[PDB]
Design a binder for these strands. Sequence first.
RNA 1: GGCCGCGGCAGGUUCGAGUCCUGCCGCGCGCCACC
Length: 443
Amino acid sequence: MKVEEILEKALELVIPDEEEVRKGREAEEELRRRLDELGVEYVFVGSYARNTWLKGSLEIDVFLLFPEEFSKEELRERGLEIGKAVLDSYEIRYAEHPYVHGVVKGVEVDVVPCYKLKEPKNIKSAVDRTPFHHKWLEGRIKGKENEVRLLKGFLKANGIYGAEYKVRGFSGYLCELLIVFYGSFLETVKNARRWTRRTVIDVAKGEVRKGEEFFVVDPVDEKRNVAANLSLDNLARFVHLCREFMEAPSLGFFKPKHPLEIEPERLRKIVEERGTAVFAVKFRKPDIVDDNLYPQLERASRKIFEFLERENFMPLRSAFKASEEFCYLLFECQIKEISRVFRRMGPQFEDERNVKKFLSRNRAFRPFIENGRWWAFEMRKFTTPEEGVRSYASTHWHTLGKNVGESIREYFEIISGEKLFKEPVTAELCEMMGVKDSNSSSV
RNA sequence: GGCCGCGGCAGGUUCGAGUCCUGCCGCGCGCCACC
Ligand SMILES: Nc1ccn([C@@H]2O[C@H](COP(=O)(O)OP(=O)(O)OP(=O)(O)O)[C@@H](O)[C@H]2O)c(=O)n1
Ligand SMILES: [Mg+2]
């Protein structure tokens, strides 16, 4: 359990076994065979072309390079055409930039169309930097392949690996740049402890400077932030893990933690012990890609959360879950019920023109003067969070994200109490409420 | 699809809105994700 003895035992978890590598090289050989037959200019990129892919996560990436003059429509129609021809089975489902996900001799393959650029300053597509990323990294990452796999596995085990909107973590390319900048996994962790939200890491200049936000400068484009989609919280979660690790190293930092089935009875006791209002908004999952869904679930959850605050239900945290059929927006509040009456502010006693208008309004109770101005007692239209959210989600369905809001419009329901604990949201509830010992890394 | 702006324009809430909530439109190949 020394710092180095543990990184030894952890390499056995992140390094692919020779039975998987052979399966990868065999698929790579067949892929080049079919691609060469089509006479298309292509290039292998990603973690596979650099031998930095994690164990159990084998995926080959192939970029097809087309002329600059091609329309975005022509790029797609030709890209998808080649892709379908090369892959055994394929699947076309993307958010913006077209590509083909499929299989070749049993391995995951992605055939991505892009432009054959010279100097990637003003890229035309989003993915035109990727060949240039591979060209810059192949010569510098050599020898340090396992130092990347330690960093990737370290993050994946703590659920902050990936730049996708489902994660908002560290892209696999960001990890490689960090190893080139620090040399080893150990040196990244040591230095990561003193990162801040202002840290700028310019790999191209071998410099660490201060800036406006966390910014890892892309060697290929000094305007591009490689860590653009790394949330501030996940940045923090990483720094916290590094300080914890150096303070007390362990192999568990690399073991993926999975949730535990919590009894619906134990959960009912925890919520009762807290005395908070725990409820959820349930609606049909819109049939869209995760990268469109999660930003909207984030938005919807925020809009309802913000509503609860200004309505004085004093919310604690928010959360959401996406099952196969349904989406859930979870909330916890300190106020299960508020009075119907509240005090609305009136004008100062001086200018009677405003006061006369203020006092003319028919109210159930008599207004009063306090500290030099008038006040009135008015009634609320709802006195609980559930009743409030019911109203908001019904009327303001449109502002909860395009697809989510349109799904909430057609139907939604607020689930509370025990009826909630039978839903697929136990894990999300325990994370939200800070329940202890609801996770484990037992194999 | 989400996010950030320069503007706006109207509407709702209010004694009172350039200031809180909402809807619509323009412009930065604006930024990010799908690789
Ligand atoms: N947010 C992202 C994600 C990736 N890439 C580019 O996409 C390539 C590979 O895509 P991806 O599969 O997403 O990352 P991998 O390096 O393959 O990581 P992993 O295999 O673990 O998924 C990288 O070379 C990188 O230049 C990028 O610039 N921006
Ligand atoms: Mg890959």
